[PDB]
Amino acid sequence: LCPFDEVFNATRFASVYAWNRKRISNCVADYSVLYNFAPFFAFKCYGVSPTKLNDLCFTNVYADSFVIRGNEVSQIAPGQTGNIADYNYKLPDDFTGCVIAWNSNKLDSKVGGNYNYRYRLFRKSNLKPFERDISTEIYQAGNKPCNGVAGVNCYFPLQSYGFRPTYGVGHQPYRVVVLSFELL
Amino acid sequence: STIEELAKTFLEKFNQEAEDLSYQSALASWDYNTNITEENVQKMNDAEAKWSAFYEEQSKLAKTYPSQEVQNLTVKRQLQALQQSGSSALSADKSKQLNTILSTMSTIYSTGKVCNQSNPQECFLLEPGLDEIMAKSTDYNERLWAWEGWRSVVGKQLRPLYEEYVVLKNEMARANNYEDYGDYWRADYEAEGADGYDYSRSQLIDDVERTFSEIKPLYEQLHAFVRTKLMDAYPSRISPTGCLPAHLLGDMWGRFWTNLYSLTVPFGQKPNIDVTDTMVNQGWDAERIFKEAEKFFVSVGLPSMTQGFWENSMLTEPGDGRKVVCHPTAWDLGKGDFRIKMCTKVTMDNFLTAHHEMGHIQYDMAYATQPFLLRNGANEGFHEAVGEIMSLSAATPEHLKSIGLLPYDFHEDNETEINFLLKQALTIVGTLPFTYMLEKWRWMVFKGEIPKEQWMQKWWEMKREIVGVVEPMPHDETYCDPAALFHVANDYSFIRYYTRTIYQFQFQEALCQAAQHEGPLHKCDISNSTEAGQKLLNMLRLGRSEPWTLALENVVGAKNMDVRPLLNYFEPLFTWLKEQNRNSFVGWSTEWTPYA
Numbered sequence: 045l046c047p048f049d050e051v052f053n054a055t056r057f058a059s060v061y062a063w064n065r066k067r068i069s070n071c072v073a074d075y076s077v078l079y080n081f082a083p084f085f086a087f088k089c090y091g092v093s094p095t096k097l098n099d100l101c102f103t104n105v106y107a108d109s110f111v112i113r114g115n116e117v118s119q120i121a122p123g124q125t126g127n128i129a130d131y132n133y134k135l136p137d138d139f140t141g142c143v144i145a146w147n148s149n150k151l152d153s154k155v156g157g158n159y160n161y162r163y164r165l166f167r168k169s170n171l172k173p174f175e176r177d178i179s180t181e182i183y184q185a186g187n188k189p190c191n192g193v194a195g196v197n198c199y200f201p202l203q204s205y206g207f208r209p210t211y212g213v214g215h216q217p218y219r220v221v222v223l224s225f226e227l228l
Numbered sequence: 229s230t231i232e233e234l235a236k237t238f239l240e241k242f243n244q245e246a247e248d249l250s251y252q253s254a255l256a257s258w259d260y261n262t263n264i265t266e267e268n269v270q271k272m273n274d275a276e277a278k279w280s281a282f283y284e285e286q287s288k289l290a291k292t293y294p295s296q297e298v299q300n301l302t303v304k305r306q307l308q309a310l311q312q313s314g315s316s317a318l319s320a321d322k323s324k325q326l327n328t329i330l331s332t333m334s335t336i337y338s339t340g341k342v343c344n345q346s347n348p349q350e351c352f353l354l355e356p357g358l359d360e361i362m363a364k365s366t367d368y369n370e371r372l373w374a375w376e377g378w379r380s381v382v383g384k385q386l387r388p389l390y391e392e393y394v395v396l397k398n399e400m401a402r403a404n405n406y407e408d409y410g411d412y413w414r415a416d417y418e419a420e421g422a423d424g425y426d427y428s429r430s431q432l433i434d435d436v437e438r439t440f441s442e443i444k445p446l447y448e449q450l451h452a453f454v455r456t457k458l459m460d461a462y463p464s465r466i467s468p469t470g471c472l473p474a475h476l477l478g479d480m481w482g483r484f485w486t487n488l489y490s491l492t493v494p495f496g497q498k499p500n501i502d503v504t505d506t507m508v509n510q511g512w513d514a515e516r517i518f519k520e521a522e523k524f525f526v527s528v529g530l531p532s533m534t535q536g537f538w539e540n541s542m543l544t545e546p547g548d549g550r551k552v553v554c555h556p557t558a559w560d561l562g563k564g565d566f567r568i569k570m571c572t573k574v575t576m577d578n579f580l581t582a583h584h585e586m587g588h589i590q591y592d593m594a595y596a597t598q599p600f601l602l603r604n605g606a607n608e609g610f611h612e613a614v615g616e617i618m619s620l621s622a623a624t625p626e627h628l629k630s631i632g633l634l635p636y637d638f639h640e641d642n643e644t645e646i647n648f649l650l651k652q653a654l655t656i657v658g659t660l661p662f663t664y665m666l667e668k669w670r671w672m673v674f675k676g677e678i679p680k681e682q683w684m685q686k687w688w689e690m691k692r693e694i695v696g697v698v699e700p701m702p703h704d705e706t707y708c709d710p711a712a713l714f715h716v717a718n719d720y721s722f723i724r725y726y727t728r729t730i731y732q733f734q735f736q737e738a739l740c741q742a743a744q745h746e747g748p749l750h751k752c753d754i755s756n757s758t759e760a761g762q763k764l765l766n767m768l769r770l771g772r773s774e775p776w777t778l779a780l781e782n783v784v785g786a787k788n789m790d791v792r793p794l795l796n797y798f799e800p801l802f803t804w805l806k807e808q809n810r811n812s813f814v815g816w817s818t819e820w821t822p823y824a
C-alpha cells in the first residue's frame with residue numbers, strides 16, 4: 045500500500061529550491077484518501093480525468109513537495125513564465141499528472157517570523173524541466189570578478205520568506221504537492 | 229556590460245529587502261498607537277533607526293548609475309525616485325545646525341502661553357484654551373487681545389530662527405542641482421512622457437493664477453455678503469467700503485470660515501438635516517456603520533474588504549485600560565495588511581468619516597500589485613481628493629432615505645438647498661485665497677525677492693489685495709506673523725490643499741456625467757452605478773507608474789486643472805447671492821484701517 049499519508053501529512057516540509065521528491069511504485073495507491081484532507085485552493089489536473097483517475101494504471105508515481113507564496117501558485121502550470129517557474133521549479137509542457145495546493149498559515153508561520161523558508165532569485169539561464177539547483181555561488185552581473193564576496197555588483201543568490209501571521213491572503217504560506225505519472 | 233542591466237538587479241534586490249523593514253516599522257508604530265507603553269516607545273525608535281539607516285545606505289549606492297542613459301521609463305522612475313538624498317549633501321556641522329534650528333522652532337509652538345489681564349494666572353495655551361475663545365466668543369475686545377497676544381508671544385521669538393532657516397534651506401536646495409527651496413517643493417509636479425504629457429515645474433505658477441482668476445467673481449460676492457452680516461454683530465467697527473478685520477473670522481488665523489455659520493444663516497427658521505436620533509431609534513452600533521460603508525462600496529463595483537481587516541482593526545475605544553491617540557487614520561502596513569483606527573460614535577459626522585477613511589483603503593488596495601517604490605498617489609493632491617467624493621456622495625438626502633434613516637414624506641426645499649450650499653461654500657471657497665497667498669509669499673521669500681527688511685510690509689499689503697483682510701493693529705519688522713501657523717513653524721508643503729479642491733470637483737462632475745444623472749450637481753449619487761466604478765478603477769490602479777496627466781485624463785477627459793465643475797457646483801448660490809446683493813457694494817478698497 046502506497047504511503048501517501050506521509051507526503052500529505054508531513055510534519056515538516058522542504059523549501060522550494062531544494063524541493064523534495066518521493067517515488068511510489070509496487071503498491072496499491074488509494075486515490076480517494078486525498079479528498080479526506082483540508083479543502084484545496086487549486087486542484088488542476090492535466091491529461092487524466094479525476095473520475096477516471098482510479099480507473100487507470102501506471103508504472104511509477106513521482107511526488108514533489110514544496111512551500112511557496114499565494115501569488116505564485118498560478119506559476120505551477122505548463123507554459124507559464126515568471127520567477128519561481130524559471131529559477132526554482134520547471135514543469136514540462138506535456139505534463140500528465142495533478143497539482144494540489146492548500147493554505148497552511150497557522151502551521152507554517154510564527155509571530156517572530158520564519159526565516160528558514162527561502163528561494164532563489166538570480167540565475168544565469170533558465171532551467172530544463174525537472175532540474176534541481178543547490179549551488180550557493182555568488183552571482184555575477186558585471187565584469188569584475190567577485191571573489192566570493194557580496195560587494196558592489198555582487199549579489200547573494202538566496203532570499204528568505206518572512207512568513208508572519210498578520211499577512212493578507214496572497215502572502216501566507218501555501219503547501220504544494222505535484223503528482224506525475226509514468227507509463228514506460 | 230550595460231546600464232539597463234545592473235539596474236534591474238539592484239531594484240529587484242532592493243524591493244524584496246525593503247518590503248520587510250517597512251513592514252516591521254509599520255507594525256511597531258501600530259503597536260505604539262494602539263497601546264502606549266515605554267517598552268513600545270523603545271521599539272518604535274529601534275525600528276525607525278534601522279529603516280532610515282538602511283535607506284540611506286541604499287541611496288548612497290544608487291547614485292552610481294547615471295539616470296540619463298536609462299531609456300525605459302518604468303525603471304527610470306524607480307531609479308530616480310531613490311536618487312534623492314536630502315541634507316546628506318551639506319556639511320557635517322551644517323547638517324546638525326539645521327536640525328537644532330528645526331527642533332527649537334517646533335518646541336516653542338506647543339509651549340506658547342499668553343498672560344491674562346487683571347490676574348497673573350489664567351495663562352492659556354493654543355490647543356486647549358484659545359481655540360475655544362476664537363470659536364465661540366463674540367466680544368471684540370477679547371478677540372483682539374488674543375490675536376495680539378499670540379503674535380506678541382510666539383512671533384517675536386520665531387523671526388531670527390526663520391532668518392537662519394531660510395539661508396540653511398536655500399543652501400540645501402542649491403546643493404542638489406535645484407534653484408531654490410520653492411523649486412524643491414515644486415518638484416512633486418514634474419512629469420515626463422510623451423510629447424504632450426510633459427509638465428515642467430515653472431508651469432505650475434501660471435496654472436495657479438490662471439485658475440484663480442475665475443474663482444474671484446464668486447468669492448467677491450461671498451465676502452461682500454459675510455461683511456454685511458458682521459455689521460449686525462459689531463455695529464460701529466465695519467466699513468461698508470472696506471476690508472475685514474483679521475480677528476473676527478471665527479478662527480485664530482482665518483484659514484476656515486465655518487464657525488461663522490451661526491451668525492450668517494440665509495433662513496434661520498428651518499432645521500438643518502440631522503439624523504442622529506434615528507440612528508439610535510433603530511439600534512445601530514459601531515460595526516453597522518462600517519458594514520453600511522462596505523455595502524455602498526461594493527454597490528458601485530469595487531472589491532470588498534479582506535477577512536483580516538475585521539480582525540485587526542480597532543473600530544472602537546478599548547475598555548481594558550489602554551490609552552490611545554484616538555484620531556481617525558487609515559494604515560497600509562503592507563503585504564496585504566490594511567487597518568483603520570478611529571473612535572467611532574453614533575454621530576452623523578462619524579458616519580461620514582467612516583466613508584472618508586474607507587476611501588483611502590480602497591485606493592491603497594487598488595495598486596498593491598505595483599512595485600514598492602511606486603506605491604503612492606500620482607501627486608500629493610489625489611490621495612485625499614479620492615476619499616472626499618465618497619463623503620460628498622454619502623451625505624445626500626436620497627442615499628440616506630434609501631438606507632432607512634429618512635421617510636418618503638421628507639421633501640427637499642429651496643431654502644434648505646441654499647443653507648446647505650452656503651455651509652459648504654464657507655468651508656471650501658473661503659480657504660483658497662488664504663492658501664494661495666501664503667504659498668506665493670513663501671515662494672517669493674525663498675528666492676530672496678523680498679529682503680529681510682520688507683517682510684511684514686509685503687505680507688500685510690498682499691493680505692489686503694488678495695484676501696481682503698486688514699490688520700487690527702500696526703506691526704513693525706520685529707514681528708513675524710506667517711510663522712504663527714502650524715505649517716510654517718514646522719516645515720510642510722501648503723499647495724496640496726489648493727489642488728485637492730479642484731480635483732475633487734472635476735472627479736465628481738466626471739463621475740456624475742458617467743452615471744446618467746439629471747439635475748443640479750450637488751444632489752448626485754453614484755450608488756448602484758457599475759459604469760461609475762471602472763472609470764474610477766482605471767486611475768486608482770496606475771499609482772505613480774505614469775505621469776499624473778494621463779491618470780487624470782483616464783477619469784476627467786482633460787489634461788490639466790480646470791475650475792468649471794467647481795463653479796457648476798455653486799451655481800444656485802451664485803445666483804441667489806447676485807440677487808440679494810442688489811443695493812450693496814462688491815469689492816474692497818485697500819486704504820481703510822481700523823487703528824487709524
Ligand SMILES: *[C@@H]1O[C@H](CO)[C@@H](O)[C@H](O)[C@H]1NC(C)=O
Binds near residue numbers: 053080081
Ligand atoms: C495527520 O497527522 C496527525 C498527527 O497526529 C494526525 O493526528 C492526523 O489525524 C493526521 N491526518 C489525518 C487526516 O489523519
Ligand SMILES: [Zn+2]
Binds near residue numbers: 588611612613
Ligand atoms: Zn482623506
